Design an enzyme around this catalytic site. Structure first.
Site, PDB file in Angstrom:
ATOM      1  N   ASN A   1      -3.572 -21.967   6.426  1.00  0.00           N
ATOM      2  CA  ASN A   1      -4.510 -21.289   7.385  1.00  0.00           C
ATOM      3  C   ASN A   1      -5.642 -20.605   6.688  1.00  0.00           C
ATOM      4  O   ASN A   1      -5.749 -20.578   5.469  1.00  0.00           O
ATOM      5  CB  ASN A   1      -3.686 -20.228   8.228  1.00  0.00           C
ATOM      6  CG  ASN A   1      -2.813 -20.854   9.344  1.00  0.00           C
ATOM      7  OD1 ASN A   1      -2.944 -22.041   9.690  1.00  0.00           O
ATOM      8  ND2 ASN A   1      -1.939 -20.055   9.897  1.00  0.00           N
TER       9      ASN A   1
ATOM     10  N   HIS B   1      -2.006 -25.694  17.099  1.00  0.00           N
ATOM     11  CA  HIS B   1      -3.196 -26.346  16.366  1.00  0.00           C
ATOM     12  C   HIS B   1      -3.578 -27.666  17.053  1.00  0.00           C
ATOM     13  O   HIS B   1      -4.001 -28.650  16.406  1.00  0.00           O
ATOM     14  CB  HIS B   1      -2.792 -26.638  14.880  1.00  0.00           C
ATOM     15  CG  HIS B   1      -2.481 -25.384  14.121  1.00  0.00           C
ATOM     16  ND1 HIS B   1      -3.398 -24.807  13.246  1.00  0.00           N
ATOM     17  CD2 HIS B   1      -1.370 -24.620  14.091  1.00  0.00           C
ATOM     18  CE1 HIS B   1      -2.846 -23.704  12.706  1.00  0.00           C
ATOM     19  NE2 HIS B   1      -1.602 -23.602  13.160  1.00  0.00           N
TER      20      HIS B   1
HETATM   21  C1  HEM Z   1       2.672 -19.988   7.092  1.00  0.00           C
HETATM   22  C2  HEM Z   1       2.716 -20.043   8.429  1.00  0.00           C
HETATM   23  C3  HEM Z   1       2.228 -21.344   9.063  1.00  0.00           C
HETATM   24  C4  HEM Z   1       1.126 -22.008   8.689  1.00  0.00           C
HETATM   25  C5  HEM Z   1       0.136 -21.672   7.555  1.00  0.00           C
HETATM   26  C6  HEM Z   1       1.027 -23.181   9.535  1.00  0.00           C
HETATM   27  C7  HEM Z   1       0.070 -24.164   9.539  1.00  0.00           C
HETATM   28  C8  HEM Z   1       0.010 -25.223  10.431  1.00  0.00           C
HETATM   29  C9  HEM Z   1      -1.161 -26.085  10.642  1.00  0.00           C
HETATM   30  C10 HEM Z   1      -2.540 -25.976   9.951  1.00  0.00           C
HETATM   31  C11 HEM Z   1      -0.836 -26.991  11.561  1.00  0.00           C
HETATM   32  C12 HEM Z   1      -1.718 -28.122  12.091  1.00  0.00           C
HETATM   33  C13 HEM Z   1      -1.487 -29.463  11.341  1.00  0.00           C
HETATM   34  C14 HEM Z   1      -2.592 -30.430  11.717  1.00  0.00           C
HETATM   35  O1  HEM Z   1      -3.795 -30.092  11.561  1.00  0.00           O
HETATM   36  O2  HEM Z   1      -2.301 -31.554  12.200  1.00  0.00           O
HETATM   37  C15 HEM Z   1       0.536 -26.773  11.954  1.00  0.00           C
HETATM   38  C16 HEM Z   1       1.224 -27.531  12.866  1.00  0.00           C
HETATM   39  C17 HEM Z   1       2.508 -27.304  13.306  1.00  0.00           C
HETATM   40  N1  HEM Z   1       3.399 -26.339  12.840  1.00  0.00           N
HETATM   41 FE1  HEM Z   1       2.833 -24.875  11.543  1.00  0.00          FE
HETATM   42  N2  HEM Z   1       2.132 -23.199  10.355  1.00  0.00           N
HETATM   43  C18 HEM Z   1       2.880 -22.051  10.168  1.00  0.00           C
HETATM   44  C19 HEM Z   1       4.061 -21.755  10.832  1.00  0.00           C
HETATM   45  C20 HEM Z   1       4.893 -22.601  11.556  1.00  0.00           C
HETATM   46  C21 HEM Z   1       6.275 -22.343  11.944  1.00  0.00           C
HETATM   47  C22 HEM Z   1       6.997 -21.006  11.591  1.00  0.00           C
HETATM   48  C23 HEM Z   1       6.730 -23.416  12.608  1.00  0.00           C
HETATM   49  C24 HEM Z   1       8.069 -23.781  13.270  1.00  0.00           C
HETATM   50  C25 HEM Z   1       9.250 -23.579  12.612  1.00  0.00           C
HETATM   51  C26 HEM Z   1       5.653 -24.366  12.699  1.00  0.00           C
HETATM   52  C27 HEM Z   1       5.716 -25.582  13.290  1.00  0.00           C
HETATM   53  C28 HEM Z   1       4.618 -26.416  13.513  1.00  0.00           C
HETATM   54  C29 HEM Z   1       4.586 -27.536  14.407  1.00  0.00           C
HETATM   55  C30 HEM Z   1       5.690 -28.042  15.346  1.00  0.00           C
HETATM   56  C31 HEM Z   1       3.181 -28.116  14.280  1.00  0.00           C
HETATM   57  C32 HEM Z   1       2.537 -29.330  14.973  1.00  0.00           C
HETATM   58  C33 HEM Z   1       2.641 -30.363  13.857  1.00  0.00           C
HETATM   59  C34 HEM Z   1       2.564 -31.770  14.415  1.00  0.00           C
HETATM   60  O3  HEM Z   1       2.655 -31.975  15.645  1.00  0.00           O
HETATM   61  O4  HEM Z   1       2.416 -32.753  13.656  1.00  0.00           O
HETATM   62  N3  HEM Z   1       4.565 -23.878  12.016  1.00  0.00           N
HETATM   63  N4  HEM Z   1       1.052 -25.709  11.236  1.00  0.00           N
END
Ligand code: HEM
Ligand code: HEM
Ligand code: HEM
Lengths: 726, 308, 726, 83
Positions: B174, B101
């Site tokens: 999402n 993202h």
């Molecule tokens: C339900 C499934 C998931 C949804 C709905 C989701 C949603 C999101 C969204 C919308 C973002 C962007 C946040 C922003 O706009 O700044 C994000 C970032 C991120 N997510 Fe997820 N995600 C999912 C699964 C996962 C999984 C399984 C992992 C790892 C265990 C993960 C790790 C991360 C990481 C490392 C970021 C970057 C956040 C940051 O740098 O601050 N995500 N996620």
């Protein structure tokens, strides 16, 4: 979950044309292509076949599909160290992108000089025609981020790391012979103006916005490089088909201590070629990775990018003999005044194995020079020497970036520096200072000399007061843009007018448009009036009476500034689309493929679906892509063989394919009943230069198409495309 | 004085339709739109008009056009601390992008519940229809980098930071109601398969390549969210015309300690709308910033994105 | 030519005793010593002799004494890339120190088991008595920073990295068998209380301040490990003479899947030995690097640190057979109840080459386990598993810290993890995910099995609600402190009392001293009354009447908990001060030195100036140090031979040397007229136990001295020392 | 840049000036100041060139280096006067 039994998951480790096999890491695609730097990276290359999956600590993993939980529907446990190591590594994969030139594509290769240059330079890598120097080259755009598009309008970077026996030399150049600004103190101002605007971070990959044109209208020193950017130089067809320039005057220093001023040039042996704007901008959407992909595939095919290093040399006593200052990076040295002397050849012949580890982490810096080279007081170069070592401290995580494998010298390096984050080298020297007695003062300084000597700066005389002041000799801004404009062909001038007109149409504040048109009026009134007309602006009487700037040392033009005024076409490595039908005339396809093969031109067979079609003689033709999947933007010419033309005659995508190719001035060849497509692009019965047509494809038909391809595009068609709805 | 004397350099601080005026920072375009978070950022907002240009140490600069040199055609001197501070700052402007993202567009706003939900949850922000909670929302794509295009085919992220009286609650969702995989241990595998392939770093912003579909073909759990990505849900017209989902079942807990399972939804009050593929793909070339632009310009026009 | 002509700058590349030669990097001092990890580091070791001095880009430097300037008294130029690279590297030399255990000293070595343990663990490194595993061990203190002193009162760390054929196993232990707290959630609170207080960042390397004792007084679970810290266990004589413990109960898992609970032990083969407090504190001033120096010099002398690994083993079905919870890391397992079974030997036999690259950058983490081991639910261990991976992201700059050479496994490691800052490995796998077909799914998961199998967690049953709750079985705080106290000799008990009395006297808020005394009264009244008396606190009648806690499974003591109850002395590697005079009796010196040599005891020859002195018979005796320069603190015993005693008889420093050594309970031996020094330490004519005296330095004089050294200190002297002004 | 984590070390409260500071520098790790200037470059028209350079003068003027005369060749050499 395994490979297919026929082995088709794995590309042949032999040269193959684009699309014939999946692309692969360089060391697996061309295992026999070697050079001293490629070999040196063997210590860190890691394979995979036949090895167990492990943690980074070497513990074998039994189940890489599940987290450890308390019951199979239970909570995940904090003691799952295998999950936490895998997800920690993932969570920290990204490093900061380069502040500028973040989007770039790189390859390995080698260089050798044609003859020794020891009379003018003691640089070891130029001393012997049979001593080869490995290189790593990164080409780039300037403005956009690492995830932006390739075929934007922008300046391009052309950075070469030479791994010499006396040190790393980086020649960190662009694809135009000047830059936009005179003094490094303004670099953040200019970059901030061309980059996405700070409130909303728009637009990516584009100078077509208010702040860039505000800065240009207020800093006329930018106009020269703006003229280059607005020409088709701003949209090269490939990194193989653009020029490279060091921009600054540097010095060569020979063994007798003599200094010669030099500017560095790369000449593309594939010739100079660029897209047209509508094509370039649409291709940013249909394949934003078009240049990265074309470079990788040319190397996989054996169409290795080759470039000739050239030097413009001016003796020290001729420093002030021109009507511009040699130290001003907004001025070019016209080749009519100082010819480019051919120095050597560089060939890029292997792709990297891992883009992050080799391309993303490579660090180039123009202060990495070697004995036999030196700097000058160009005030833009002077400031660059600060920035490129500074920025790696954040980008690459500390001062040991030279131990990242791609950056390591292949010659010896020893000194008293120590520690810093992720220090690889374990020093055994009992001393970490000099002078020391405890290690008998090793490693030791080396006097300068004719070869293998220590670096000493050329003892240039410096006389002046400590001032923050621009040299008065840099205060002329219009004569070089004018020389460039007058040296373009008529169609290149039309494209320049279109580039400024398009860009300023996207500037929201109209007074900025007006101010840029007033600058243009100081360069050439025909240019300014043509841009003003497209913008609905009328020049004032005072603007019509601006006196043109002077000629540059008597020149009214220099044709080496044009992409196209002097033929230099090379069709090897270009690509043609062949629009298939469901019963292709096999004798046409035989003749087409044979002729293309003889010139090294590749083909992509397209249809309205994927899979195969069968020709009239039973030959099964695999389909590379659909008409929509691989549009005409991605090829250099289109050929349509005969067969069952009714199968495709009314297909909208096939007809549009030809209309897009026609609009974009590409050669089209139509055989047999494919001539019924003449009606879609309004070709007269008598034919048109740029459309090859005949009852069958044969020797004459292919020779004509190939002659058209050697001229790159059909410029004569330009007046006929404004009416075409495509 | 470089501004035009007519004042046309400066956009009106009133709602205006897209393209009528240059866009501006929100606090200059809409100074009277306020909420408790936007007011709390006043301590760090820095203006500019009428102030002297200075180093970061507050020293006024006299000549911001030239490096210090020994002679006007001479070498630049190491003692030029004004040049070196400016260039040092420039040299370290970039931080790592988000691992996924990385391409996203954000705005401020506020949330209010229709009625107290104290029967099902003790969450303070849902306790009182007169309690306003500031929000900050980021919409995003998944695969491409921060400089990739907006109208790719992809899942979209929809993340909302609620600045409540009892702590920050982030609802990080999402635009489809499920995910591609079942267990987090596979997330680096799935993401590596959809991201550009590791030898050459191609393709940007696209799942249309061999490693994505190799993984899908080997992990049928992915097929449900792949169906949603392949539909026109994968190419929304705007962030205003897509749905949001928290995906997971969470719990609500009331003051009596009763737990209720919940899944979170956002309904777009502008309705649902998507592009068609050829248009979306073409638009990634003609305007790669189309969704970021449309969001900013809808807010400057007063066409506020609203979601239930 | 800066080295002296006689070669005396270069240390002998052979074993030499402390002080005989300057110390050196390990691969230069001991080129013949090897093991599989030292051999694998050769690819990053960098030499120096005979090489030119270069930049990090391999450019040879001609002048490393001057910046580039405009004129020899002019301004420094920005184009000086040699000066800016060297200063940039220097400017970024430092990395964050470890949050705890920042001060530490390390060495390489090897481990071998005595027999295969395949009946109880499938761990490869314990499967074959011929299988030798390289190790790297770092010893540390806990509280102070990297530049704090070695001989503070503190817990010591003992961390061992085993480079096994099935992965890195890190045994990250301390020198006491328990820790201060029960649940990792309190670790930041406890460490913030012991650390320098946050307003003024005082005191360094000390628990003697209000916040530490505030926390202890409010958290009685800390009292067990606090009792250890206040004992002479808090001030070891050397890392060679302390115990090590894993603290937590872990599991061993055999090939049949059977789990056995285990606690890990290191037994020092040099025996157990500690300083006394006045000596330890003074030594932090006179040699704050005393333990680092002793460790390094022992290894250079061939006095290799040796430890025996041992296991306390409890069968699964005996989990609840004790009065305390096996999972509670504030409880020890008394050896009287569960004996330590000898497992194997570790020998540390090579110092590092570069302290920063090998010691500072080493990462140890207790989650680094291998098949055949597993964790338990100890709630302090459970939290530790999170911290050690996380903290490396800032300390070592990112997720590639396993690629820093010292941290690399020597066994294969392959997985799908990619990128991150400092990425060294260049992955050639076409896939970076699994499952994949395009690389036939390599590298591949491996099922668990008896040897070389994938890691699987033991399927322990979990049953309970999600709670933030301490187990009631952990709620007993005083019985283990009382067992420890009763297990101490009378002189050890006295030094415990004195440790609490000194620390609590530095607490400024008297009520905190009162609250600590109240906790001591729940442990042992005698202890509490003796501390109270030193603090001017009187116990109340209610405090005098607290019932002592129960015995632990019937034990009213366990002598394995005392340092000294059971003699285990070894004199090899200890050091004696020999006080010279300007006319030493050579027959005395010959006999002393012969006897010390035979038992592997070192000597330092001291006098009032440097240089040499001459014996009565012409022998020239080189002086190591002066009385003030190498004080008695740094030796284990003092011997004064005969000769011209009047030379040193009224030398204050010489007199003070013997008073200091006498105070600190060290054996002292006086030959002939050196017996006149009896008056300075108030020794009677008939003599006393612990002072060896005779007409000459043989017959039984050195045997007597050596027997005193085997018993370490002269504990019977303690009554006599208070009347010495020293 | 390594010790304090990036180029915004002047925003760490103890390092902050108490007098005004305004310029066209942007971003960097843990950027505290939220700039509202429409421009992040100069010269600009879109914010009437603010914040603006100030000529040197007796009070509240911009910094100018003393115009010391420099005459010599580019050398790596210790003055003999220092020997
Ligand atoms: C339900 C499934 C998931 C949804 C709905 C989701 C949603 C999101 C969204 C919308 C973002 C962007 C946040 C922003 O706009 O700044 C994000 C970032 C991120 N997510 Fe997820 N995600 C999912 C699964 C996962 C999984 C399984 C992992 C790892 C265990 C993960 C790790 C991360 C990481 C490392 C970021 C970057 C956040 C940051 O740098 O601050 N995500 N996620
Ligand atoms: C003649 C004018 C210049 C040319 C031709 C030029 C060329 C380039 C090129 C081609 C790159 C990309 C190299 C790569 O592939 O990684 C680059 C990066 C860079 N340049 Fe320049 N540049 C110019 C002026 C400047 C100035 C004036 C500054 C600032 C004082 C500057 C600072 C930087 C920085 C910080 C990077 C990114 C370096 C990295 O992270 O490794 N450049 N430049
Ligand atoms: C039985 C209790 C513990 C023991 C025996 C122990 C042992 C050690 C030792 C010996 C070291 C020094 C390792 C080296 O030389 O690098 C260390 C470091 C460390 N420990 Fe612990 N520890 C304990 C509890 C904890 C807890 C509860 C935490 C936090 C949850 C923690 C976090 C750390 C951290 C952050 C370091 C520095 C590691 C690094 O920077 O690489 N420890 N520990």
């Amino acid at each position: 979950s395994l490979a297919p039994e026929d082995g088709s998951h794995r590309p042949a480790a032999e040269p193959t044309p684009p699309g014939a096999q999946p692309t692969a890491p360089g060391s697996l695609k061309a295992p026999d292509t070697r050079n001293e730097k490629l070999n040196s990276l063997e210590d860190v290359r890691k394979g995979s076949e036949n090895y167990a999956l492990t943690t980074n600590q070497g513990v074998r993993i039994a189940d890489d599909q599940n987290s450890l939980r308390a019951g199979s529907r239970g909570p995940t446990l904090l003691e799952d160290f295998i999950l936490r190591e895998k997800i920690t590594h993932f969570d920290h994969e990204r490093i900061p992108e380069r502040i500028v030139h973040a989007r770039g594509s790189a390859a390995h290769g080698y260089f050798q000089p044609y003859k020794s240059l020891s009379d003018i330079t003691k640089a070891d890598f130029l001393s012997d025609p049979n001593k080869i120097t490995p290189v790593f080259v990164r080409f780039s755009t300037v403005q956009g981020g690492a995830g932006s598009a390739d075929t934007v309008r922008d300046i391009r970077g052309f950075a070469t790391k030479f791994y010499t026996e006396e040190g790393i030399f980086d020649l960190v150049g662009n694809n135009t012979p000047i830059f936009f600004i005179q003094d490094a103190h303004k670099f953040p101002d200019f970059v901030h103006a061309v980059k996405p605007e700070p409130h909303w971070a728009i637009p990516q990959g584009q100078s077509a916005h208010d702040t860039f044109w505000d800065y240009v209208s207020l800093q006329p020193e930018t106009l020269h490089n703006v003229m280059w950017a607005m020409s088709d130089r701003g949209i090269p067809r490939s990194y193989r088909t653009m020029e490279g320039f060091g921009v600054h005057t540097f010095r060569l220093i020979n063994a007798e201590g003599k200094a010669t001023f030099v500017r560095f040039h790369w000449k593309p042996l594939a010739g100079k070629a660029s897209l047209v704007w509508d094509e370039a901008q649409k291709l940013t959407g249909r394949d934003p990775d078009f240049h990265r992909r074309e470079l990788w595939e040319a190397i996989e095919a054996g169409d290795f990018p080759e470039y000739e290093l050239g030097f413009q040399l001016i003796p020290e006593e001729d420093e002030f003999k021109f009507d511009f200052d040699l130290l001003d990076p907004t001025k070019l040295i016209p080749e009519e005044l100082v010819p480019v002397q051919r120095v050597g050849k560089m060939v890029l012949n292997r792709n990297p194995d891992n883009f992050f580890a080799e391309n993303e982490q490579a660090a180039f810096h123009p202060g990495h020079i070697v004995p036999g080279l030196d700097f000058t007081n160009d005030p833009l170069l002077q400031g660059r020497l600060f920035s490129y070592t500074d920025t790696q401290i954040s980008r690459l995580g500390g001062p040991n970036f030279h131990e990242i494998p791609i950056n390591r010298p292949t010659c010896p390096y020893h000194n008293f520096q120590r520690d810093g984050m992720h220090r690889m080298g374990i020093d055994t020297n009992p001393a970490n200072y000099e002078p020391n007695s405890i290690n008998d003062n090793w490693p030791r300084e080396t006097p300068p000399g004719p070869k293998r000597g220590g670096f000493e700066s050329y003892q240039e005389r410096v006389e002046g007061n400590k001032v923050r002041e621009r040299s008065p000799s840099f205060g002329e801004y219009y004569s070089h843009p004018r020389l460039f404009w007058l040296s373009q062909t008529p169609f290149e001038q039309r494209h320049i007018v279109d580039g400024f007109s398009f860009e300023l149409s996207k500037v929201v504040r109209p007074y900025i448009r007006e101010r840029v048109v007033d600058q243009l009026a100081h360069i050439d009134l025909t240019l300014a009036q043509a841009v003003a007309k497209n913008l609905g602006i009328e020049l004032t009487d005072d603007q019509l009476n601006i006196t043109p700037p002077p000629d540059v040392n008597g020149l009214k033009k220099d044709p080496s500034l044009s992409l196209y005024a002097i033929p230099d076409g090379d069709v090897k490595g270009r690509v043609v689309a062949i629009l298939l039908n469901d019963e292709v005339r096999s004798a046409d396809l035989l003749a087409i493929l044979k002729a293309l093969k003889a010139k090294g031109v590749h083909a992509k067979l397209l249809y309205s679906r994927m899979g195969e079609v069968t020709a009239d003689d039973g030959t099964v033709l695999p389909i590379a892509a659909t008409f929509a999947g691989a549009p005409s933007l991605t090829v250099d010419a289109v050929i349509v063989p005969c067969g069952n033309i009714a199968d495709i005659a009314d297909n909208g995508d096939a007809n549009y394919y030809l209309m897009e190719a026609y609009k974009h001035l590409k050669p089209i060849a139509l055989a047999g009943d494919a001539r019924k497509f003449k009606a879609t692009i309004k070709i007269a019965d008598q034919g048109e230069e740029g459309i090859v047509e005949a009852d069958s494809a044969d020797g004459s038909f292919m020779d004509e198409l190939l002659t058209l391809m050697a001229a790159h595009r059909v410029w004569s068609r330009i007046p006929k495309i404004d009416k075409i709805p495509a």
